[PDB]
């Protein structure tokens with residue numbers, strides 16, 4: 001085994017990204033059972049120097065296989081290529097030389113967007129402008145990722161993170177999901193930018209149900225039949241009909257008649273200008 005046998009693991013130095021280990025202070029886990037895997041940390045100088053910011057850090061669990069090493073390197077490498085955008089979880093640096101493998105990313109203090117919304121459900125805080133703002137920002141992030149030839153494949157609210165100032169940041173771009181899959185991905189395993197638009201529709205619905213679970217009481221086995229037979233989710237009560245309209249256009253059976261992310265950005269931007 002690579003990890004079993006090596007005293008030192010000779011990953012190549014990439015100076016664009018290598019980050020000095022003495023500038024990084026590991027903190028508490030950044031999940032439930034995520035000790036030894038994903039943690040909070042403080043990182044100094046990124047630079048506006050001698051100054052600290054909070055970041056997130058992934059590492060290999062003490063029982064990691066060669067496969068886990070590969071997955072983490074792959075993910076690190078994908079994040080190198082994509083570039084920087086305000087509405088994605090950006091790579092900040094890597095520690096690969098002279099010690100354990102660390103992948104360092106932006107930390108969004110408020111967690112994922114499903115739980116952000118669910119926690120703040122009324123019996124306002126989650127007003128229509130707030131919801132539209134979440135929708136708009138996710139759309140901009142996707143427009144960016146699509147421009148970098150990146151198909152997400154698992155765009156869902158659990159995979160959007162919320163910063164201290166309520167900025168949306170898409171995560172898991174560098175890697176039950178069935179309910180978020182376009183028919184052509186379910187049936188034919190084809191993923192396109194337009195299958196991510198479908199996924200976005202579902203995410204919109206998540207937003208407007210304040211973190212609701214899609215297709216309530218429908219077993220994932222029948223979802224395939226139902227969607228082929230033209231089943232679609234209904235309008236959330238927190239949703240004006242004009243928005244439900246967008247949602248439904250995202251779930252058009254024909255990929256070419258779904259809007260693009262550019263159009264979703266522009267439509268949503270107008271709804272903000274209206275308020």
Ligand SMILES: */C=C\C(=O)NCc1ccc(-n2nc3c(=O)[nH]nc(N)c3c2-c2oc3ccc(C)cc3c2C)cc1
Pocket residue numbers: 030031033034035037038056057058075089103104105106107108109110111112161171172
């Ligand atoms: C420990 C098991 C496990 O890996 N669970 C999945 C998982 C999903 C997300 C995060 N995580 N939560 C975050 C948060 O609330 N705020 N900001 C960030 N960045 C958060 C993450 C997260 O941390 C890292 C570190 C490194 C990479 C490459 C990616 C991510 C993400 C998405 C933790 C665990």
